[model samples]
Target: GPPTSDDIFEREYKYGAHNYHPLPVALERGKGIYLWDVEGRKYFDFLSSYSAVNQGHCHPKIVNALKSQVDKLTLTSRAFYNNVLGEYEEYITKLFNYHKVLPMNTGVEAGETACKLARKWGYTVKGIQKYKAKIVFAAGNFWGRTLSAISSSTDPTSYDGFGPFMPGFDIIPYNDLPALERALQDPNVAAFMVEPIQGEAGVVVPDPGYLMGVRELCTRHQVLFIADEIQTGLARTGRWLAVDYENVRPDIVLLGKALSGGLYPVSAVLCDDDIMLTIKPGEHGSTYGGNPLGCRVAIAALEVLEEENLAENADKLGIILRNELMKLPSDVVTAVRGKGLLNAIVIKETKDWDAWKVCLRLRDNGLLAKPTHGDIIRFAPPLVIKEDELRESIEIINKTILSF
Candidate 1:
């Protein structure tokens, strides 16, 4: 039976775990770039579940693959090869020109895998002795909530009460090439794990040429280059991957969100055999890594992205949204900066940057976005948005801004 909105609300309040502080609306289902609340109210999905729905909600192609594969196969861990795994990996690797795909089930798993790959490369290939591998990290990064990820993070909220953590990691300021250059001097350093666009860090975009410069430095030093493209890959950032602006290949690419078309938990670490060959077959893996069902869904997702030209669509809509935002009359709105469909509302000019309150206003105005730390709110919608709908969203934003 379909429950009323308040019925679901009361149930969540009574029994659900106290983890998330959600908006007042309770979403029940969705399609494309739009969501329907249990109350039957609809809103444009601006946050895109932190860019996980870059392929859009219940995207037909991915959903079709999932439905079909569900009847055939799903689970078969790395203990044995599954048919769909090899087929999907081949298609994905060739699409991105990656050497190999190390499949895993979550962003954190893939991130941990990437870190391990880098350190292994350091010890085995970079001539660093075993147990001395180090990775430099960008401050304000949001890798994951895992022990190793939290161990290197600067966010107290993510690290508080978690201790006795992983070693061999150092933090550096984002967009500062010289800090990276200086950190590279440490013989113990193996790679630098960083986000191409700091999505969880309030949608921060690094300075132009920052990524290009980092790529060059990593090459010159023979240090591995690791990009946490979990949030910025796919078509969400108007490119295949956020780092594509540099037009350079990273040694390790960690991707998670949208890889299964937001249909399942899926992620992978893609790199050359030189980096992957270091791991013995028994060294690492997961129970559900590279399952047939996930492979089918993810490949269909990638194909939909190309077949529908979602990347170009994201690029075009992004410009329109950004341009329209620049014309808003409130000085409470500070400068806007981002690429493609990924962006943020920076309140550097406001006396109080009340990001939380601003988010509430946006909710009432028929859009759903969330604030990160400080006075910044991320604004990333699905790539499948149309111009008319986007223009309506722009008007809603104008109203919300004036409310603030």
Candidate 2:
């Protein structure tokens, strides 16, 4: 299709939601670790679709799986068994070591499923005496925007006017061990749901060993731990799951975003059968849950990750990228920090940090990035980025920052 009557940006503004303010560049195509705007200018995609393109943009294997599956069967509503779904369930179960999974169409659904299960399990398994089940949430967490999820959020913008929120949820400060320990002391608390690395909250990481200690405390209190790995899982943070760094396992492992190679919005709640079996036969499900196309595509997506060795690659290149990026003038830089390809460089002295301006400069220098907040920009390229390309991109970033 031609540009028709307007450029992509103008069209989006004219009809699409304006909640998200994207950069001015109009990207119309992508390949590997780069994107080409509608005007045909190439730019290294530093964000990697918010860490979903672990296999890179327009990866041939993932795309082929999608095409092949769509040609045969796209959706069967999960009412009847799909050949691909069963196989994927088994494959992913072994990959994550979860006994069962309730597939969903998006990350938010997966989060909701986890929430429902936690409360139900507390009532049924832990005997929380129904209606008294309480789940603890960490402040600065970005699970999703669903009503129940938003009810748990402490961020003003996420919860403002979206209330009267759901009840039985309590908020605790992130990385505050005492707050969590206090919540667990209450027998009514059924679960503690949180992100391993709070990505949307400026890549905020807990102190080293803080996460493992939380897991131990949860187990000691007989409360379930649910991890929303929608963004941080799948080797985005230099490991298969951030939990693996400390060998701490959660009761529910919620996965999404990268599971479909950033092509489709597929998510699943992976957990042990003992915990998952609490849901009654009709208690939980989705119309597109484990659709044949999503099933095969996700299976192939996971395979591509293992075969391509993306986890190790992110870990190696990420270190090099961060060390090279820290050479800018300190007067303009507030701080530089993160794990793997995930990083946040805070700028100082500007009431208006203008991350958009920095992103614009990066785009002109043949790189792409979007700011996470008013003060900081997140740098996370795809995991499959080549060493030479990473070095080259680093040079581009170096010159761009100095130029800015």
Candidate 3:
């Protein structure tokens, strides 16, 4: 028998892992900035799949590229070079102004790859003793679910019961210049891995000039700066890269999420030769990294970002969103803060309020967003969102928020 919506949800609850507590809607399809539930109800997608669909859901350019590549070649592993990998490597390196790119499959793999390269560079270039080099990370980071990745995390839910954690990592309070400087003072510190906007930390934007200060400190202490652009990259924040707002180039930049326009899993690490070449041959690899299909889809995604001028669109729309959201007469909205379209509304605690309940209200009112941490509701729509569409969302948001 064909499964109904209730059956689907029941089966998932019965059989699937309970790792995530997603919204009640069972999304069946998506197009552009909107999604359809299994019951055929429509809602605007405010999360953009955590900003991976920056090029918009089911983008024709990216999807066609994927379909074409699927008919041609897919995975070649790292055993032999495929024709598309070089083209992709060149395209991404030039696009990001880096000398080389090491492709991976997901955001965490990108972070992990960056860590491995940073350690190798520390040993070979900085002459740090093998197995003793340390990498510094900021507090409240969401790097991924890997053991080493979780080792640097301060989030209890992410790191809980995942011990014993790995060593050689130091965590400092994010956006604290003195703490970052103090950690870098150690000669064993090889790199500082940071998120430019701290996306998973509820779209927390650091104080102005904080990123530049980190760059300066890293330079003074001879430490590598690794920018994890997984959630904040690819026009999500109205810039090609979030770090671009600081006008500072990192020693290593980790990219994912939107690299394949949410059509396929593709991620990459960008850096110059001196640091990237530390791993000569076979120090690290992945079976599906830089696959032909992934490369083609990513290429199409980047082109769409440029052709559609999504960055400019995000810049214009973000200003409108923030400005309008700040004016809403909702007492529960404690604050509105974000750069570009990567935004969040911090809800004040009222006797009748919580972020989860607020999100359910948003769903009922024909929009979809999610709460991060406990009190913050993140609003990151696709870059393709139009001015009229944005205004409509603003109405839905204000109505739902004010209803409380």
Candidate 4:
């Protein structure tokens, strides 16, 4: 007999460490904007694996790139240069308009690399005293679960029980210029890292000109501005980068998630030579950092974003999504906020109804979206979704809410 969903769930619970609390459905496969469970139940994938599948699931071009490169070359380990690494480097840097890129395997690794680079630049270039350089992060920032990441975290769920946090770190309120200015007053501050639109914090889009203010303050303070676009970059926010909304550039940009179109773990830290060159050759790197397979897939993924006009599509469809959601009765939905396809709805909780229940209803209605923070459901579908498919998902959502 074929393995059932219950069997798979039991095995995972018994063997795997308890970390994530996923929705009940056991997805088997995905393509474009749809997912099929083990029971062959089809659903509209509303999350896109947290914005990592912007090119859609198992895109043929990206998969082909991975396949073609796998048999030829994979991991060169930075031990020596491979044939394809340079091409990838050039492609990405040129696309993003960065002077250099430091490749890593995961978003958290890129975050860590950016912090290291900032500290080094602080000491070597900014004239910060040794061991005194401090990195500042926003209150609701969610980079990853690493020790250093948790040290800068304000969320109790992320940092609790992970004691003895990293030193030389400061926290400031997000979207607040005065708070940021105060934090940068300390001469020891090395960098101010932020997510242009807070993703894990329920898609908290900041006020207009916030990025511009951050750039100006960082420049005036001689502190580096680090934009962690791990979840919000690569057309997730209907822009090439969220900072683009303000026409502001950061000193360091951290990218991940969709970098390889959900096929592989690929992340990169982008910066100019002045800040990037601070880290010496042997001081940093990863075995799979610049692997040919991931590089090839990333190139293809980027090409797909351009060829399919996914960014433009996201921008156009985002307005429609928000407009339609806004028309829903205000009692059921407290708010609908986000840029591009990375939108979320704040469900008004009643005695028997809440976001979790709403998600279950969404699942039953052939749509898959999960709640964040208690009452907020993020509705980020694949950018490749057609307008009609988006409208269908919206109907499912409207019908589900009305049923409640």
Cα miss at 43, model 4 (Å)?
0.4
Candidate 1, superposed: residue stretches over 4 Å from native: 348-353
- Could you give me the TM-score of model 3 versus the true structure? 0.98
lDDT of 1 by residue, 223-260 (tens): 88899999999988888998997786888998888888
Alpha-carbon runs more than 4 Å astray in model 2: 1-6, 349-353
Q: Which regions of candidate 4 fall more than 4 Å away from where they truly are?
A: none
Better of 1 and 2 by lDDT: 1
lDDT of model 2, residue 96 = 89
Over 299-359, each residue of candidate 4 has an lDDT whose tens digit, in order, gives 9999999889888999999999999999899998999999999999998888979999999
Q: What's the TM-score of each model vs. the native?
A: 0.96, 0.97, 0.98, 0.99
Q: Give the lowest summed-lDDT range of ten residues in model 4.
A: 1-10
TM-score of 1: 0.96
For residue 122, model 1's alpha carbon misses the true position, in angstroms, by 1.2
RMSD of each: 1.8, 1.6, 1.0, 0.9
Candidate 2 — which pairs collide?
none
Error of model 2, residue 331, in angstroms: 1.6
